[PDB]
Short mmCIF file of N, CA, C and O (backbone and C1' of nucleotides) in Angstrom, two decimals:
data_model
loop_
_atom_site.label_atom_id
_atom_site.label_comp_id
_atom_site.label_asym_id
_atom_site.label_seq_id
_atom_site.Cartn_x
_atom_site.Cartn_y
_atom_site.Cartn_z
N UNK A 16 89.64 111.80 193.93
CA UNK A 16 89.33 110.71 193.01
C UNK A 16 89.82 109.37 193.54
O UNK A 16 90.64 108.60 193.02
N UNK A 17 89.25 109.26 194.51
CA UNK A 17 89.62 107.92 194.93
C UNK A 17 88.00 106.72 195.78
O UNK A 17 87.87 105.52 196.02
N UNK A 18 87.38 107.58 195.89
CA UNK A 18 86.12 107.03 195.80
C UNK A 18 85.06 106.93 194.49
O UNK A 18 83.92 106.46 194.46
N UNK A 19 85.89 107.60 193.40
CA UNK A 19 84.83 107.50 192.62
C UNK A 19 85.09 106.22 191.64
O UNK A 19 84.39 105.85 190.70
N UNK A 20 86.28 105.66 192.13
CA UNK A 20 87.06 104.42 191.25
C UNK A 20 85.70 103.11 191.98
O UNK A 20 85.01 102.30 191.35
N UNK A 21 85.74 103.36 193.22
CA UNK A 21 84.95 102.02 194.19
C UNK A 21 83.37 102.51 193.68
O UNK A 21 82.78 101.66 193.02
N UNK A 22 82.83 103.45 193.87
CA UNK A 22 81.80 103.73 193.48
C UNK A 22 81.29 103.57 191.92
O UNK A 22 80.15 103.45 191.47
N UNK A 23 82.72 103.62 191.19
CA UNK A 23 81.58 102.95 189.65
C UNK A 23 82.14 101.00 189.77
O UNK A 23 81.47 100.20 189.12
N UNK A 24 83.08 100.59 190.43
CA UNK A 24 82.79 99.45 190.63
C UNK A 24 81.92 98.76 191.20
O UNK A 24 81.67 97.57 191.00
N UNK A 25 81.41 99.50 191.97
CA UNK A 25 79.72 99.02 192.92
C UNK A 25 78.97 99.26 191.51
O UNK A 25 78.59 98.23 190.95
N UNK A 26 78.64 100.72 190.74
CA UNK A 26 77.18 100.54 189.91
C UNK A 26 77.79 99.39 189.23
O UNK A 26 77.12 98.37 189.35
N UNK A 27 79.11 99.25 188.41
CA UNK A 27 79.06 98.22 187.53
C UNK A 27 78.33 96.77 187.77
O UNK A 27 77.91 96.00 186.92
N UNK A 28 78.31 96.66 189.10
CA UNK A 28 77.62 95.43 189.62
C UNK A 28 76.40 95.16 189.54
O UNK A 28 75.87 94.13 189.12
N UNK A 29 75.95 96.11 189.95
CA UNK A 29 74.29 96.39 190.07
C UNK A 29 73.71 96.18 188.36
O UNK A 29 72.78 95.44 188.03
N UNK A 30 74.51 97.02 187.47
CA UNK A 30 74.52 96.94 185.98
C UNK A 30 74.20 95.25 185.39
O UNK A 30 73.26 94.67 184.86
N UNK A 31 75.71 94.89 185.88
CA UNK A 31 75.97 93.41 185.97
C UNK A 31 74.88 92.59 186.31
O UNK A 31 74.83 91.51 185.72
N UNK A 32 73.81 92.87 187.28
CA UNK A 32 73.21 91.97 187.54
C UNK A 32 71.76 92.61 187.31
O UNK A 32 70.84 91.80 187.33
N UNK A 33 71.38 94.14 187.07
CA UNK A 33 70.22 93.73 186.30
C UNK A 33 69.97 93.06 184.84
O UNK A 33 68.85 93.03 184.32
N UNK A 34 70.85 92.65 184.37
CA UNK A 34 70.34 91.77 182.69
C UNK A 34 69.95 90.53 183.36
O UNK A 34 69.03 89.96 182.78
N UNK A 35 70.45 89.86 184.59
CA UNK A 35 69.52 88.60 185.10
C UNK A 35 67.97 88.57 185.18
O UNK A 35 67.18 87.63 185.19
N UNK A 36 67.77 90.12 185.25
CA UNK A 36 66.06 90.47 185.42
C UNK A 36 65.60 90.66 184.50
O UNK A 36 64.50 90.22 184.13
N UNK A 37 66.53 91.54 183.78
CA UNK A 37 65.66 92.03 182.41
C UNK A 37 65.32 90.62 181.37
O UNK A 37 64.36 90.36 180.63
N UNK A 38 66.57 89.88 181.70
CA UNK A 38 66.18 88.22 180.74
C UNK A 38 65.02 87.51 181.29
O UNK A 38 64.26 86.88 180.56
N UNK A 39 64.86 87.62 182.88
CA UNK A 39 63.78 86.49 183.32
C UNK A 39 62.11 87.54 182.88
O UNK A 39 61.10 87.14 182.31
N UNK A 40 62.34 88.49 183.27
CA UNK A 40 61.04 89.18 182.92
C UNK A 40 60.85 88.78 181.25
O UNK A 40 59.80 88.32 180.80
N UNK A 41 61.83 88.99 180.59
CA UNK A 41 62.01 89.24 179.18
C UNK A 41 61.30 90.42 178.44
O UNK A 41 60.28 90.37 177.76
N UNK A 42 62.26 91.72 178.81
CA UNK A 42 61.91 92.93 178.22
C UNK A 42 63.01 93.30 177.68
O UNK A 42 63.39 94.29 178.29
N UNK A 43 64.03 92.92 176.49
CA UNK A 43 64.98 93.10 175.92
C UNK A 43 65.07 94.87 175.78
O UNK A 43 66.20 95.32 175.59
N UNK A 44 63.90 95.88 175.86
CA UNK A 44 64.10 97.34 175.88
C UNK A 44 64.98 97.74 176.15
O UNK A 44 65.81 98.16 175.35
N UNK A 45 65.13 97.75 177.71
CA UNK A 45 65.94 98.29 178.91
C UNK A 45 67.40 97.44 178.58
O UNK A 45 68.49 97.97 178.35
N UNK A 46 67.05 95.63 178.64
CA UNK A 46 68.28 95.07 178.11
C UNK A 46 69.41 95.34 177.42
O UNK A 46 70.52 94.84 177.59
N UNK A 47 69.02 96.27 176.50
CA UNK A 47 69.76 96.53 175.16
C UNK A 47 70.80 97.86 175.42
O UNK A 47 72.00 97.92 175.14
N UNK A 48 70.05 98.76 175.98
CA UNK A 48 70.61 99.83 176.43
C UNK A 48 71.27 99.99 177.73
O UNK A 48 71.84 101.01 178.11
N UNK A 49 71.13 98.65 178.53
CA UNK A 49 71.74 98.74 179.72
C UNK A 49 73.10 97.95 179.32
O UNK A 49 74.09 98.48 179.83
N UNK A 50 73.37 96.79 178.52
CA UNK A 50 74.39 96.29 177.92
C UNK A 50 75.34 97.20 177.53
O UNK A 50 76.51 97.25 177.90
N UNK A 51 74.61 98.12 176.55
CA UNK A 51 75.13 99.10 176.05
C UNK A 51 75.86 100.21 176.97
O UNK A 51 76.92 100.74 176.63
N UNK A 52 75.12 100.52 178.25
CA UNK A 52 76.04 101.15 179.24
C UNK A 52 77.00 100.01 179.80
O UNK A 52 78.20 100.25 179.95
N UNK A 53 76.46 98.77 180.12
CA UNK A 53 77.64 98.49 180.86
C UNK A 53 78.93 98.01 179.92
O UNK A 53 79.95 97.81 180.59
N UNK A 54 79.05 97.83 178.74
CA UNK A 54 80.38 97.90 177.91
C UNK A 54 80.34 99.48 177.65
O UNK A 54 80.47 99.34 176.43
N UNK A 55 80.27 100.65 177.78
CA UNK A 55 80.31 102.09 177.96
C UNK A 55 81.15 102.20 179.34
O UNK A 55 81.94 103.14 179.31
N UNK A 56 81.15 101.51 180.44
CA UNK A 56 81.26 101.92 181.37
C UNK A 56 82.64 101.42 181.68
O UNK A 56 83.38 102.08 182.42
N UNK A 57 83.08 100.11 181.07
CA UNK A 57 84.42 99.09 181.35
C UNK A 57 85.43 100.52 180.60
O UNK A 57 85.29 100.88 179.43
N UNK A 58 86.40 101.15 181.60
CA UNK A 58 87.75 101.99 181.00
C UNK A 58 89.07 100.78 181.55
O UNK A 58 89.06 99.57 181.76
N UNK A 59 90.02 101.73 181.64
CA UNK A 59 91.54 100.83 181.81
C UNK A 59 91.67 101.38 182.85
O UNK A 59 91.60 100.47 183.68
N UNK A 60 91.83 102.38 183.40
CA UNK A 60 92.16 102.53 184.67
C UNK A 60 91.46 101.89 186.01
O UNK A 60 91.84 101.71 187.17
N UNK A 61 90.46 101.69 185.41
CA UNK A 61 89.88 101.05 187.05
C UNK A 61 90.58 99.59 186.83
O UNK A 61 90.76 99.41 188.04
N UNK A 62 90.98 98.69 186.38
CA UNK A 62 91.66 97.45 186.34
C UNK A 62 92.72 97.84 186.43
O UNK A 62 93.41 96.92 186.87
N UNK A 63 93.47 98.97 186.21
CA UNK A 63 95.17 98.72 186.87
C UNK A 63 95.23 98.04 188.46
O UNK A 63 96.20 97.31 188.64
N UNK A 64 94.67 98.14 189.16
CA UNK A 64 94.32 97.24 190.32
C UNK A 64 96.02 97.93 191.13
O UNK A 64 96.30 99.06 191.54
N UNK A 65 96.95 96.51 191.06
CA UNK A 65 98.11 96.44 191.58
C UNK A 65 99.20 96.58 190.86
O UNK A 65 99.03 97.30 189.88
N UNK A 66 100.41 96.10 190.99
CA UNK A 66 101.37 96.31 190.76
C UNK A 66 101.90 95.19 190.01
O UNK A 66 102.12 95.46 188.84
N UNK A 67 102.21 93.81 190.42
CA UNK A 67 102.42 92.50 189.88
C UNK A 67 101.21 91.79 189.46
O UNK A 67 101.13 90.56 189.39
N UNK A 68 100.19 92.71 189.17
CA UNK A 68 98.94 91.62 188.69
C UNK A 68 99.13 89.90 187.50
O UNK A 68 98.57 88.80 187.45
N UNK A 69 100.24 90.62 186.76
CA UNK A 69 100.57 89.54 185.85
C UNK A 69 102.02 89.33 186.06
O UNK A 69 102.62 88.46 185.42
P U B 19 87.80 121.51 214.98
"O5'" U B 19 88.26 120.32 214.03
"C5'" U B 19 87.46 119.93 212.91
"C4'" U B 19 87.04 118.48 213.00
"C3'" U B 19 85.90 118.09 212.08
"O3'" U B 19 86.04 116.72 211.69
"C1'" U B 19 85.23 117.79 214.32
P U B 20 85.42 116.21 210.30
"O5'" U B 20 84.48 115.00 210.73
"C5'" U B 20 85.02 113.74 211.10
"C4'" U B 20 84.28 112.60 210.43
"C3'" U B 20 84.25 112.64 208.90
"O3'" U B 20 84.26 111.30 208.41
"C1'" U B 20 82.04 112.70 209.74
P U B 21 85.39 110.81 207.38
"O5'" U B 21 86.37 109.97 208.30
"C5'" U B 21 87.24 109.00 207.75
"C4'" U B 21 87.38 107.82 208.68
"C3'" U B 21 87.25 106.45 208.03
"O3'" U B 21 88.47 106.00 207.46
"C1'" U B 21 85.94 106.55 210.02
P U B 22 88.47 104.92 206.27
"O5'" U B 22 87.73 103.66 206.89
"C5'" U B 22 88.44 102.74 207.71
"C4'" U B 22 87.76 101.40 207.75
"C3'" U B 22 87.28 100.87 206.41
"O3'" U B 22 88.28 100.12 205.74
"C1'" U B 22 85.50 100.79 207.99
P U B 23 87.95 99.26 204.42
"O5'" U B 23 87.23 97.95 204.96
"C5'" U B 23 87.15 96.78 204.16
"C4'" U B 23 85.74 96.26 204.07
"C3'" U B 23 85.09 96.31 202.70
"O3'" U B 23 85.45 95.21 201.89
"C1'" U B 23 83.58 97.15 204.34
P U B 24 85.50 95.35 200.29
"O5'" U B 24 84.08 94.82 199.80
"C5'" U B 24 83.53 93.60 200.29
"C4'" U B 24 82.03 93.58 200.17
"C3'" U B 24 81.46 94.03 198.83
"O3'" U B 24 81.48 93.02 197.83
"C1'" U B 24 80.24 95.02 200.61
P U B 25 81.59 93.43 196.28
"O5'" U B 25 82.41 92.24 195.62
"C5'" U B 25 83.82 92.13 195.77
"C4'" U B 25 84.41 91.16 194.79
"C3'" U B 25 83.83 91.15 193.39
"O3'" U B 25 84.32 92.18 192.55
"C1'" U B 25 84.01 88.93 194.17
P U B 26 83.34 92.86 191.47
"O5'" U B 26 83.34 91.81 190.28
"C5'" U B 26 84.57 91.38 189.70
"C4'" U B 26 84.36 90.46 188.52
"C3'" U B 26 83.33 90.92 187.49
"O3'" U B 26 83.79 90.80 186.13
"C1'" U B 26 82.74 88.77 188.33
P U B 27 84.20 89.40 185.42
"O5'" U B 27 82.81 88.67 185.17
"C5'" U B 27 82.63 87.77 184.08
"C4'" U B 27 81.55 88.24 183.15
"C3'" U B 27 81.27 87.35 181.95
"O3'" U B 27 80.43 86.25 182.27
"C1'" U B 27 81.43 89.60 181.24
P U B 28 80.81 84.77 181.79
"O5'" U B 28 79.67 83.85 182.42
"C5'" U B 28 78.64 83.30 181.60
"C4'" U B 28 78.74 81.80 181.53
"C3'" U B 28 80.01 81.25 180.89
"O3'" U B 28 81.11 81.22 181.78
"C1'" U B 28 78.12 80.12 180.03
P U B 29 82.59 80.94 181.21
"O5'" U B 29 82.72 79.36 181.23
"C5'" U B 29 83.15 78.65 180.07
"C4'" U B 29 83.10 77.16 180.28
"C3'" U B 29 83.25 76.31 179.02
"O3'" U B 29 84.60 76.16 178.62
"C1'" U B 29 81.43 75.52 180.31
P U B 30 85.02 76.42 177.09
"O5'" U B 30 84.47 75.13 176.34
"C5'" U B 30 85.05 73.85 176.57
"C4'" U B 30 84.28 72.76 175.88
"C3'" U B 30 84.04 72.95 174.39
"O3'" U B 30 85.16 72.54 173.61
"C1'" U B 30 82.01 72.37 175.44
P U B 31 86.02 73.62 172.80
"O5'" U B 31 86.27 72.94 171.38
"C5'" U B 31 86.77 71.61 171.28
"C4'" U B 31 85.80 70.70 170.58
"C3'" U B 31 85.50 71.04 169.12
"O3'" U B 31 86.49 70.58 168.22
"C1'" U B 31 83.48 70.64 170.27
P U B 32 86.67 71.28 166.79
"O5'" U B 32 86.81 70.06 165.77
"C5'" U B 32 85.94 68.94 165.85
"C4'" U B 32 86.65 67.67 165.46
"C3'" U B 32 86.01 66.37 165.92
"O3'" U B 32 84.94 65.96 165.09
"C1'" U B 32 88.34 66.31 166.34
P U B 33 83.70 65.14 165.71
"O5'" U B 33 83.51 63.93 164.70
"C5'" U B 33 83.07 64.16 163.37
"C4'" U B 33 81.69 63.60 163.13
"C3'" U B 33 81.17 63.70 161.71
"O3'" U B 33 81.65 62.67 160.87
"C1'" U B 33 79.51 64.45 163.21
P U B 34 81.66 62.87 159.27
"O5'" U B 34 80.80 61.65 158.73
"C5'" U B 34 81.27 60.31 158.82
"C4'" U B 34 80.16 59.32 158.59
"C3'" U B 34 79.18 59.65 157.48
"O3'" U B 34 79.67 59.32 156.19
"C1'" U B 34 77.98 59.02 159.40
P U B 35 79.46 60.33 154.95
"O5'" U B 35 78.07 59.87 154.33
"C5'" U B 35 77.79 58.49 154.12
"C4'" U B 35 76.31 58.22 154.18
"C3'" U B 35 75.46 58.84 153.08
"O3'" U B 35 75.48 58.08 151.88
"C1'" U B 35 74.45 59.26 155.17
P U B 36 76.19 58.65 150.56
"O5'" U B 36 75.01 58.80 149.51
"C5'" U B 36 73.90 57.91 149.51
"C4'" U B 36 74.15 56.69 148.66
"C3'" U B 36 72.94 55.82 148.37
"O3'" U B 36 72.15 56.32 147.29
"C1'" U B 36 74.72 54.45 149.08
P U B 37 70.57 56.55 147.47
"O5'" U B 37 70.00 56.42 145.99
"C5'" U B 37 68.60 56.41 145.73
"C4'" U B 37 68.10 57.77 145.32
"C3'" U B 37 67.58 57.88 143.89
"O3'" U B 37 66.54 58.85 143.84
"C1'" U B 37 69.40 59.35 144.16
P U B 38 65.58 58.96 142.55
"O5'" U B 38 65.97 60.36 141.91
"C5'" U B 38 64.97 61.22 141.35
"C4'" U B 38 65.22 61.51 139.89
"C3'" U B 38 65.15 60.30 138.97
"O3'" U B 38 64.68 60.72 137.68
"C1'" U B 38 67.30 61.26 138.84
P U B 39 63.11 60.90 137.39
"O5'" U B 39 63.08 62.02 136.26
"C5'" U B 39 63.84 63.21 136.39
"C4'" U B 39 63.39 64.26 135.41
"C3'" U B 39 61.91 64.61 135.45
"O3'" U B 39 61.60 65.59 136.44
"C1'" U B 39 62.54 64.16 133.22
P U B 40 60.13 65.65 137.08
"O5'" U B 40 59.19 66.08 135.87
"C5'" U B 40 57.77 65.95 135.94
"C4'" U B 40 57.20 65.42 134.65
"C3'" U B 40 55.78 64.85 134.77
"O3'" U B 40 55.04 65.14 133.59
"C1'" U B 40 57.28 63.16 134.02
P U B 41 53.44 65.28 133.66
"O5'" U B 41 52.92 63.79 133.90
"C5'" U B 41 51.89 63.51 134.85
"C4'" U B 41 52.09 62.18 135.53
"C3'" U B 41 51.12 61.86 136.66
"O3'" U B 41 50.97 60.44 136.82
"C1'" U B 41 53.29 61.98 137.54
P U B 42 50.63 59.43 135.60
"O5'" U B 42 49.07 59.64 135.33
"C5'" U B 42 48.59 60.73 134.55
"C4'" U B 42 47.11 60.91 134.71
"C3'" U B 42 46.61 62.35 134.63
"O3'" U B 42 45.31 62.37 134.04
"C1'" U B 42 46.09 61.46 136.76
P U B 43 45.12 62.95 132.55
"O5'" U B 43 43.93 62.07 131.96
"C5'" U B 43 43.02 62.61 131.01
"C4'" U B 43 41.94 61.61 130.68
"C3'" U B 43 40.70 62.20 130.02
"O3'" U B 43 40.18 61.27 129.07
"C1'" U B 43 40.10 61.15 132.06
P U B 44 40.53 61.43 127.51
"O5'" U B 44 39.19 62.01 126.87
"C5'" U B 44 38.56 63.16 127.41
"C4'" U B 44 37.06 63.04 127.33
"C3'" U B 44 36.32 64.26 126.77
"O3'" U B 44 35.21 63.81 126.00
"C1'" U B 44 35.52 63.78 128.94
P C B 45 35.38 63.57 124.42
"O5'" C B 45 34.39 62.36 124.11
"C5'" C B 45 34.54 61.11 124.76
"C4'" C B 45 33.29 60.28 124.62
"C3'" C B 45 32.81 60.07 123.19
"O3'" C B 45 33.48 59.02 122.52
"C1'" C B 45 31.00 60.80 124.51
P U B 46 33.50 59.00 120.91
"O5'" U B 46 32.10 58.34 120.53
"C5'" U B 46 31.65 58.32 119.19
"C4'" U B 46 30.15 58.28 119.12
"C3'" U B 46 29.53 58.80 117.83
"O3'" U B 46 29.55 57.84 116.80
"C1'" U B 46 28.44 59.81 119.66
P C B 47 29.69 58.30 115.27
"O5'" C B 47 28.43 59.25 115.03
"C5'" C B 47 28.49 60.30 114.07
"C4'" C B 47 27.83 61.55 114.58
"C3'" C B 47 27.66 62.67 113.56
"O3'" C B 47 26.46 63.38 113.83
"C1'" C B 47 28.98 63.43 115.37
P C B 48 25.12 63.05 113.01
"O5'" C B 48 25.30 63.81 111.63
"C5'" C B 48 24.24 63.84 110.68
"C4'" C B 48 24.68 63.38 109.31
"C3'" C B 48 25.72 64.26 108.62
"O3'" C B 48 26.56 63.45 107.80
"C1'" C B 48 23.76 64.19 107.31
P U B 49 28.10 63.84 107.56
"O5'" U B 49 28.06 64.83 106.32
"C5'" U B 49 29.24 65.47 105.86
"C4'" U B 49 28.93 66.67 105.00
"C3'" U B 49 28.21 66.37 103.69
"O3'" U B 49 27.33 67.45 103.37
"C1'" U B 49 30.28 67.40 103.22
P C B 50 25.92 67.17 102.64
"O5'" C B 50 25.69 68.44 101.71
"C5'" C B 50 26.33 68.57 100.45
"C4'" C B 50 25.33 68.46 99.31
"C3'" C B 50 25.82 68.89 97.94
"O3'" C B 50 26.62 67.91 97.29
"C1'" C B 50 23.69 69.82 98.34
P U B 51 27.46 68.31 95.97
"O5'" U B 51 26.43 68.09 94.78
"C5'" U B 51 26.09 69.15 93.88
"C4'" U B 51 25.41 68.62 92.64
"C3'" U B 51 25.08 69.67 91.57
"O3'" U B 51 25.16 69.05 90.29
"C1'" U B 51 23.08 68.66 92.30
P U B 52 25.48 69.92 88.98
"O5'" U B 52 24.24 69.64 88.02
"C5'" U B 52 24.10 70.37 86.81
"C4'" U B 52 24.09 69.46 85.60
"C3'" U B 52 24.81 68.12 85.75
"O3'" U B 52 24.02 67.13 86.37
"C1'" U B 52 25.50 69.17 83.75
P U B 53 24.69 65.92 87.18
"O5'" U B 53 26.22 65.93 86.71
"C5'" U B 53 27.06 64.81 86.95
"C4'" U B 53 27.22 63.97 85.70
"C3'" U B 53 28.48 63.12 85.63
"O3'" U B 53 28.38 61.89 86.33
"C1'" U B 53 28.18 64.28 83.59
P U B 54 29.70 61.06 86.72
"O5'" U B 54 30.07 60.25 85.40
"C5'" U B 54 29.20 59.26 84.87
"C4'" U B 54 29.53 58.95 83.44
"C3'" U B 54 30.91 58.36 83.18
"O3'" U B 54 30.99 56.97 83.44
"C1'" U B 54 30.46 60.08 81.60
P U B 55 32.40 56.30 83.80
"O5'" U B 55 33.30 57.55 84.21
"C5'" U B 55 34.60 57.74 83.65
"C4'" U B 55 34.73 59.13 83.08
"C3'" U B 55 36.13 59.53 82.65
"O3'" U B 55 36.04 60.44 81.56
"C1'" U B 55 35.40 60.98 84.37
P U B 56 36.49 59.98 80.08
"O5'" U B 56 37.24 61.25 79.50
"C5'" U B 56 36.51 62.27 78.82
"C4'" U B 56 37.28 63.57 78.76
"C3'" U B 56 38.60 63.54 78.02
"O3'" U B 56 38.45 63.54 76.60
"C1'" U B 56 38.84 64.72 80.06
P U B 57 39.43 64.33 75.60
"O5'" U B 57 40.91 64.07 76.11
"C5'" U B 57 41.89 65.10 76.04
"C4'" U B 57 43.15 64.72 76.78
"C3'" U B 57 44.14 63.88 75.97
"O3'" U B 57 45.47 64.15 76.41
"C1'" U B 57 43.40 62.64 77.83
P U B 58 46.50 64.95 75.47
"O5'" U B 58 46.58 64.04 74.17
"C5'" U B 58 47.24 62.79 74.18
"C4'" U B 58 47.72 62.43 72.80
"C3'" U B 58 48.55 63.49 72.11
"O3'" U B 58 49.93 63.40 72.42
"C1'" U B 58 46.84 62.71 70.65
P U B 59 50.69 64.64 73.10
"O5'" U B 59 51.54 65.27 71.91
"C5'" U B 59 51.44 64.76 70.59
"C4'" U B 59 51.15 65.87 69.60
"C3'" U B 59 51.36 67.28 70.11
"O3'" U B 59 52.69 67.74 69.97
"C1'" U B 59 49.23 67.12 69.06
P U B 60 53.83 67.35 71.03
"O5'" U B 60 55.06 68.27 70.61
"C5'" U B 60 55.30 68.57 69.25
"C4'" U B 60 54.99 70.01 68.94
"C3'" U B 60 55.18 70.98 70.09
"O3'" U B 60 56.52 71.39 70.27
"C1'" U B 60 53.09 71.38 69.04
P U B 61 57.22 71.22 71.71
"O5'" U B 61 57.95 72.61 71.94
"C5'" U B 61 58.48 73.34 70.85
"C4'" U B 61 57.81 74.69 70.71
"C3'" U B 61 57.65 75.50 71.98
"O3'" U B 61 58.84 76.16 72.38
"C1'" U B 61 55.63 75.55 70.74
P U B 62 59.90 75.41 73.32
"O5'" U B 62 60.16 76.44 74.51
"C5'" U B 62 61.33 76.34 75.31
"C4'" U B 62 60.99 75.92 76.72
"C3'" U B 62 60.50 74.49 76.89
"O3'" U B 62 61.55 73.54 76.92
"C1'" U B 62 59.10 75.97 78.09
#
RNA sequence: UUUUUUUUUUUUUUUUUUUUUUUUUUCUCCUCUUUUUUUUUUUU
């Protein structure tokens, strides 16, 4: 379990940046439910990051 | 005997206003028959 931390930070991106498409096309369908995964997808452990972050 | 790297949730908030129910039409129009008009009066 140490690639699968980098690997949902890559889809989160991809996530992240299809609502730029789904808004310019304007098909709120897919929009709605992809939002919906990508706040599904934000946990706490993948942001523990480091040690002194704050 | 299969390594290394590929960022992410738009920035903004400390704007004034001195009125008052309604609201706006419909024309002129042949009234039939015993009468002058009876009448005081008293019992409420």
């Amino acid at each position: 379990e140490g690639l699968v931390v980098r690997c949902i930070q890559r889809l989160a991106e991809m996530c992240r940046s299809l609502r730029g498409a789904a808004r310019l096309v304007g098909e709120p369908v897919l929009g709605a439910k992809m939002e919906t995964a990508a706040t599904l997808l934000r946990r706490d452990i993948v942001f523990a990051a480091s040690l002194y972050t704050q």
